[PDB]
Amino acid sequence: MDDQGCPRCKTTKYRNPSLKLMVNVCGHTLCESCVDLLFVRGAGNCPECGTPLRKSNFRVQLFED
């Protein structure tokens, strides 16, 4: 539930033991705390390759079972 730790707000899953990361079109990674600060401040910019997200798009998950 931690791994390398979120990219934008690198802190959640590593500190927070109850979240998940959502991937986007290009297929990268957006922790739960990212989709919150990534869009509230712009929305449409991958947390890493800044790909021009046609419009948000973040599939979160973690359980896997």
Question: Where along the sequence are the contacts to Zn ion (CB under 5 A)?
Answer: 6, 8-9, 26, 28, 31, 33-34, 46, 49, 51
Give CA–CA dist 38/30, Å, rounded. 9
Q: Which is nearer to Zn ion, 12 or 64 (CB)?
A: 12
- Report the residue number, 26 or 65, with the smaller CB distance to Zn ion: 26
CB of 65 to Zn ion, least distance (A): 23
Looking at the Cβ atoms of 60 and 65, the one nearer to Zn ion is 60
Q: Is 25 exposed, middle or buried (0-12, 13-18, 19+ CB in 10 A)?
A: middle
